[PDB]
Subunit: 151 residues, 6 copies
Amino acid sequence: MVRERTFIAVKPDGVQRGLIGEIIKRFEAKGFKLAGMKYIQASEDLLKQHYIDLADKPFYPGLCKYMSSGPVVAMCWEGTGVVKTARVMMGETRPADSKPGTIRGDFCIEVGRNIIHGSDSVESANKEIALWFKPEELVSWTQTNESWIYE
Amino acid sequence: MVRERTFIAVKPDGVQRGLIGEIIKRFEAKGFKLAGMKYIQASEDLLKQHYIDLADKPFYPGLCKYMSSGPVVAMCWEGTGVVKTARVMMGETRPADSKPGTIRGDFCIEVGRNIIHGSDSVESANKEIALWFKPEELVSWTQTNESWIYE
Amino acid sequence: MVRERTFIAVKPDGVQRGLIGEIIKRFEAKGFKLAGMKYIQASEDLLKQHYIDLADKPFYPGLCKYMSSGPVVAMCWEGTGVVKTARVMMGETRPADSKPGTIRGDFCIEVGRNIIHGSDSVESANKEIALWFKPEELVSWTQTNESWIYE
Amino acid sequence: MVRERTFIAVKPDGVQRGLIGEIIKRFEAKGFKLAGMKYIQASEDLLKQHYIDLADKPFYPGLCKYMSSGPVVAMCWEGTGVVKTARVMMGETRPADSKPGTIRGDFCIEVGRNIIHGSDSVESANKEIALWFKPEELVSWTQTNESWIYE
Amino acid sequence: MVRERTFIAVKPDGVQRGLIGEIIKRFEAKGFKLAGMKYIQASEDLLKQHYIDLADKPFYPGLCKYMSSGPVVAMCWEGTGVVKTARVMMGETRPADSKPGTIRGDFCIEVGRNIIHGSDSVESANKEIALWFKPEELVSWTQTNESWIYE
Amino acid sequence: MVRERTFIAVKPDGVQRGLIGEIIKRFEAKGFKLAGMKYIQASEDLLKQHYIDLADKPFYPGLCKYMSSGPVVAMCWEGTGVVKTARVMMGETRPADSKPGTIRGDFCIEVGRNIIHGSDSVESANKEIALWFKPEELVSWTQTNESWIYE
Ligand SMILES: Nc1ccn([C@H]2C[C@H](O)[C@@H](COP(=O)(O)OP(=O)(O)O)O2)c(=O)n1
Ligand SMILES: Nc1ccn([C@H]2C[C@H](O)[C@@H](COP(=O)(O)OP(=O)(O)O)O2)c(=O)n1
Ligand SMILES: Nc1ccn([C@H]2C[C@H](O)[C@@H](COP(=O)(O)OP(=O)(O)O)O2)c(=O)n1
Ligand SMILES: Nc1ccn([C@H]2C[C@H](O)[C@@H](COP(=O)(O)OP(=O)(O)O)O2)c(=O)n1
Ligand SMILES: Nc1ccn([C@H]2C[C@H](O)[C@@H](COP(=O)(O)OP(=O)(O)O)O2)c(=O)n1
Ligand SMILES: Nc1ccn([C@H]2C[C@H](O)[C@@H](COP(=O)(O)OP(=O)(O)O)O2)c(=O)n1
Ligand SMILES: [Mg+2]
Ligand SMILES: [Mg+2]
Ligand SMILES: [Mg+2]
Ligand SMILES: [Mg+2]
Ligand SMILES: [Mg+2]
Ligand SMILES: [Mg+2]
């Protein structure tokens, strides 16, 4: 009944370049179930927490201001192996390492403008989802076509 | 810098059939700016207020229950003439009267399953937005290609 | 529950120009149910029966030999009012009079090369369906998302 | 000139999820020639022959009843090396191991719901083509753009 | 053999918004034959001539500077009724009067940013094509699929 | 403001099969900037120079005749790492080795009919561009969304 969930974000360059629908469409088409979504400009402090494990890296300060400089689409998607499979659908961290067919492969060039975020582990997803959504903002429901996706 | 706003919601049949990205895509491709978005299963009572001008019609009670029976994507879109243009993009109330190229025209058959809602006038839009969004949930921002959409 | 049915054929120019998938895609997206499909080079005699009401016309003989000069995709699609709605989805008899968004409007130019056929009435459909399919070749099944297409 | 042929089936979850057009679209775009197609709910016995080499496996019985529980699109596609290339276009047996850009990679999640079938060898194809189609149901024709696909 | 031709331009907002391929794709898909194409930033003087019949209108001076302020895709397309049919595919002069499914209907809001140009008559097309292409820059050739488009 | 350039040409089979918009679309969606474009049927001798490093190989004479036998779209695309990334987007020299998601992977079958050309290195690109474009035919301009592609 209840399956694995991950945190997915359309970054500000994704919003600005008009790729929200294209990204959602790819996840709907794959078979994953939307559990949460909101549209916000988050605080620099929230992003500092979101990327807390990278607080060490040189790019960290600039990253968090950039990721809070504009609206992002915050999402929670549900389905078997969704944390890892979402990463595959995105490509690699660097669009230059990303295959055609992937989101970053089809749409971006630079690492600092790679339009999308996804949790790198189940445990990360739990933190990120909790950081971005209140429990009551998460919708539990049953997709009608579930039995043609999961046996 | 602030333009006309309208309320667009993807209905529970739209969500169920994996048409969220597809609908958002069409509004992005048209040139409109996403101003608000959230994902909820709303109360039957919320839907009663949304459709208050229809409380007399026979189909009303069922409509409000169906429109609250599963999650919906609630959106606010912004741009010159967006209220009327969104209606044009949806088609008619009856999918049977909707032309190919329109959202209802391309994707559905029955009036009771017409996948999308849109405000029918500026005054309706203001009411509907205030009902589904909190003021702080409407995002103020500048799209970079705006000068290629508006002269 | 068996609903209205109509006969749709991908014409030889449709097959030759690689539009079979695109055409089927449009009917699936619309919500209609594929009830029958086969792939044949039909006899000149079958086509002469199929186009019997136009046997008077000067274009008739060339028409009947052309529609039997190559493989066609024979289909039966099912859904409420599928007969009339399919016509709307196709456009007009002449591509020149078909709107963008419709199949003939989007994909072709001449009346003699208008890639698709559809029944013009419930009774034309019954006769044509009967002409191209044996009863057992019409498949009875339930699409799972039916309750999100029909109320 | 008749070239290599392979057997492709849209599985019941493919039919149910509205992916028939999308799948055919991919093979037409690739350059392959549709040589055969029919739409059936095949017998459990036919499927037991079709999956004969896996009759040992624990998943086999459920597999054979599931693949005969609903309509499938049976196809024969023709083109050089069509057998192996179709497999590449499908992805791997498990959707989880299939890359984005492939059919199972783009559209599904579980191995038991992997929407499409294709022959794994020239000889598997000959046997399967023979199993699902009567000889006369395989159509001989020349696609006009052949000289732009094959040198 | 030789069919009607018209002048089509992707305006600077079309180039800037990444819609070149989308527009060409629509004309290739319709069946028209590409006879000429070049990518240039034209002089204000050339545009003054291009729009010479509107030299009277208040918007004329600004129009010609805007249409020469950046690269445009200049094209010549060939096919029956292509002058008039190209106009239909574009929509109306005002995107607000344009239907969904049309280029302007799907993609624009304002009259001053309506991304595409097309000749309004056969006689205009002759002038515009001649203005934008040297005779040797026009390619006469035969599309292989012509006999499936024109009988 | 001036980035790496590469030469991309849509081959005569690409033109013939209506893949021009489709290819241009993929380069626009990726983030690259169109720097040059023209549409020609080039001389056999021009193609001999284009492929000069291959004059020894057996397939060379036929290749140069085929590559000059119909019109081609000649293009110059600009962006960080565009030379290598364009190759990635095309796939391998043999479509048989090209993955789904790539241009050759999605659209063709044989090595002699592989619809697109791309420079294999910066030095090859410089030579090829100088051969197919005059200096003044390369357009200098600023894309508005560049700051969403490059940080
Ligand atoms: N040199 C770098 C590396 C990463 N970034 C950005 C872009 C990355 O998506 C975020 C987070 O990097 P991370 O190591 O977590 O990689 P993923 O996004 O999870 O694939 O930081 C950057 O701006 N410059
Ligand atoms: N005969 C009818 C008419 C409307 N409905 C439903 C479906 C409609 O989309 C909603 C809203 O009715 P309304 O008149 O506001 O029409 P729109 O949705 O704005 O196009 O009511 C119905 O179920 N049966
Ligand atoms: N003047 C004409 C009229 C019809 N045809 C062809 C093209 C049409 O699709 C078929 C059938 O004509 P019909 O009147 O039944 O029109 P529909 O196909 O139902 O749209 O014949 C023609 O070639 N020339
Ligand atoms: N462990 C497994 C292996 C296969 N199946 C299903 C799914 C597969 O598509 C069919 C056939 O398996 P097969 O080994 O022939 O793999 P392919 O379909 O040819 O990719 O059986 C399963 O449900 N569980
Ligand atoms: N009020 C207006 C009217 C037209 N324009 C622009 C936009 C139009 O495409 C061009 C030419 O107008 P025209 O009357 O020839 O109409 P078409 O483009 O041929 O449909 O001028 C404008 O910028 N402001
Ligand atoms: N065995 C071969 C190898 C190459 N060709 C053709 C087709 C190739 O695209 C061109 C160019 O050869 P090249 O080694 O430069 O390969 P690329 O096109 O850059 O991928 O030659 C051929 O016809 N037969
Ligand atoms: Mg991370
Ligand atoms: Mg109303
Ligand atoms: Mg008729
Ligand atoms: Mg096998
Ligand atoms: Mg004009
Ligand atoms: Mg080379």
